[PDB]
Symmetry: C4
Subunit: 302 residues, 4 copies
């Protein structure tokens, strides 16, 4: 039996990350930019989008446009993004942008704005779709196209990758490409680790992401009712990890979407959490590529 | 590629609305009146209603009456409406009524009461149904009939429109009719804007509405558990926008339904929010047609 | 057009109920007793039960027993019922029991206990099933059997009726039987009213019930997370109605289930609400038949 | 009519458990260890897992691996388990581990760690799957294999059993095997009881478990939004039972999963509850086998 999953990881002995500034916790705020790259018959897809909107019981419509769904996504690119970017500038916290290439193509000025502000542009795929059933040839073709578009748009190729709705081949293809420093398509640890299955042989860093400390839950069946639920949820995660960080620091990812936390009713809670985190000493507010370069310098692959 | 959606909007430069009384925020409370116009085999539909009731997992019943569903809707027209109207009169806040024409026909006295109180009657369609799949000929026919009924009932034609569950043709037809000042069938901004696609050429104002600061969420899968969740949600939206309004005022819509916020358990939270909003200076409590006339005088279409 | 629904009711002029003791509000606590009468292949049904249990995503199993579901229902009859009955005895608040006849047959001692404590036994149908699709002949036969069983078990025939999941014929059949003082199969008002469609001609009182101030929501998709959500929800309903009751008193129903509020985690909130209600003067804690007899003496049918 | 269910139980006269140290309540914290034994085509199943993860609307994928689902489960075995075990060691509270045999085989070191810490290893089945439709021959074969694996791994055979998603034969087979002291596959009481249907004739103890004071609800449609909801829920259950325990002590089960409460955002609430429980005198923090041995000594089967 050759069991491909690693259920053990670091076991009872996770490594000390030695974060900069003696930090007891590292925080990675991530802003997804997906608006303009989601399912739409305009984009050539077979159906309309149904995932992550105020229309909490929406289903895909075959061969149809869902106008309300489209409008909800437009809030993200029209209004939410600028509000969120302002918030992070006000507290001088850097972002990593999981940017969908097709979305970025449709609003190049906001992407340019993000680059000028010093945020990291990470690849979030060519399209914002589910890759579960896509043939390997086509998924690999999407991947290379995502890199092309983001390189042209930002000026440098992306060094991180996150699909989200992966298939069985996604991560293998990402690591096979050779050019990424890291990917985030796992939810399996509180610390980065070197991928144990990289035949390429080059070191590939895994920086796990999150589906729980993530504003996606505002629109899911099991899901925050009000902003303060998200604040309390983040505060609890922070508290437990910051406590552990007296001896064994870890990291925490906070996932955000323009069309979701960009609504004023939800932004208030994110600000309260940022204020809470800022009120503590020894917190490393950082970007994901910075975590990756740090890991390389601190725990090189052996 | 001719991409029909506007993902950019005002970009990073939204206009100053110069609301009356130097207001830092404009609030539009909206009361939907749908009861008596929803799906029912009595109305000629193929199935019973399932959307927005205490029967949170209800499905449409083909060729059947759902008696419990009917009774829940009746609470709205029998009891909830009068309670809500009293609340708004007590704080002297005007309403815009998204009135469904068939519903209004069935309770002309409550509509007359709303008109005498000075509330704006806006069209919410001929029937409260999903227009996704309706042929353009029939949808346009519905539209003209809605205008006919509301004109006869109120004494003047409606100047605003909101379908809700739109199809691909709805907004185009509304703007094509020529007689509306505005529509609200978008969720894409925090400010009104002139429709960029009106071949008619006449200026048509878009006043975006909301599916999040909306009591509909009390009955949806992702949804407020208690009144205070809705209060906190509205309070957060208000706070963020009122703060921004020190330099760049915006608006906020609060959507209400007779059968939902009309229940005493839920009305309490709406009153607490009204009290909260009233405790602030520089708040414009207004109707949607008043926003439209203001926009015309302040930022005429160029 | 002969529209069978009454969307208007009392309109803007609800009657003053003149509750005993000058009460500003009447409270009707209702305990459902359904355990042992729900769907089960043992009972002859085609499938297992799926409605109102901790197994919130359960579906009916065709031709199968669902052992976990059965066990959850058994908690109600084994443990929850006695805990709830004790609570009400401790505060000397009377109950109306919506008792399912088949359930009562299976635990005659608890029914006898309820009768000795002075609680009203109201009929909740022969079986706890959905009557939407049942033929009129069979539904009427069920009804008469429910009356037979409850009469034998309690010593007197039931004078109230509540099916819950009604079909198009349920209420008509109940009123046709002639022997009931009232039914509760509506959710359409805050006050009792005389049925406008009783060809029998005898006065039949409607005492509306509730799906919102009801512990059923602890197990539904849109649903209280913790006890305090239910407490706050009830407190808000009470507050609004008690306020209105300075000039126009109304009633409020609180619906309970043995297998649900009988759990200690949920009972605490009900006790807090009972304490809250008891802390106010001018509250009529009563049974539904008592409301009906009061209405007869105070607002006889004309 | 031979009705197989016991709807009555102890009726109004539950026995006094005489817990050690004069305890007014007995608490059984249970940690499920399922990770590595859930549905997976790697394990020979027909589909991927969908139950109890952050992917709250996940469905099984036929003949496919769901990589995100796998990664979420891996968090449990990689990171959550060690965090949870540390918490319980810090407060010196013993655990009962419902261990799935296939899961234990895949991480023998964590199981050995649990045994050395003095936790009880209880059988949670050979595989973490739904047994509703499994033939009796195959279910019995699974059972014996679970016992084999756990005996080899722990050094002694398991004396308790809990499947969870039982079929109509599960409990009968468990009791037929002869070697268990107890099982927990019911949710029907607040106290242990002797199984009334054990033809074996040997006494078999039932120690009811829970689907409500259970962290599974963090991922279910009806489900805690934030940690504090779970804390309040547990606190309420504790309070009501501790109050009753002045005269009639009972027990309370607290169900936990590595991949769920192991997340820092959720662990905080469990710690707050442990602190709350510890702040009271007369609380028996115990293991399930210890409850069983106590029952044998205190209320032997007659």
């Amino acid at each position: 039996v050759d069991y491909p999953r690693d259920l053990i990881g670091y076991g009872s002995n996770p490594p000390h990350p030695h974060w900069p500034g003696k930090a007891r916790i590292a925080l990675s705020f991530v802003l997804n930019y997906e608006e303009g790259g989601e399912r739409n018959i305009l984009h050539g897809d077979k159906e309309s989008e149904a995932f992550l909107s105020e229309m909490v019981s929406a289903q895909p419509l075959q061969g149809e446009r869902n106008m309300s769904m489209e409008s909800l996504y437009e809030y993200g690119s029209r209004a939410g993004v600028w509000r969120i970017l302002k918030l992070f500038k006000a507290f001088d916290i850097p972002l990593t942008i999981f940017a969908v290439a097709m979305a970025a193509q449709r609003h190049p000025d906001v992407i340019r704005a993000m680059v000028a502000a010093g945020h990291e542009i990470c690849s979030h795929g060519y399209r914002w779709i589910d890759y579960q059933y896509m043939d390997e040839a086509q998924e690999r073709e999407h991947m290379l196209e995502a890199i092309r578009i983001l390189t042209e748009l930002t000026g440098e190729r992306p060094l991180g990758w996150y699909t989200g709705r992966t298939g069985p081949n996604t991560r293998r293809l990402v690591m096979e490409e050779g050019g990424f420093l890291y990917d985030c398509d796992t939810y399996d640890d509180d610390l980065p680790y070197w991928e144990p299955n990289n035949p390429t042989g080059k070191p590939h860093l895994v920086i796990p992401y999150t589906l729980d400390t993530n504003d996606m839950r505002f629109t899911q069946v099991q899901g925050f009712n009000k902003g303060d639920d998200f604040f309390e949820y983040l505060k609890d995660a922070f508290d437990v990890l910051y406590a552990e960080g007296a001896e064994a620091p870890k990291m925490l990812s906070i996932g955000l979407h323009c069309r979701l936390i960009g609504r004023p009713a939800r932004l208030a809670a994110l600000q309260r959490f940022i204020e809470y985190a800022k009120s503590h000493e020894q917190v490393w507010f950082t970007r994901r590529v910075d975590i990756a370069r740090h890991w390389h310098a601190t725990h090189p692959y052996t």
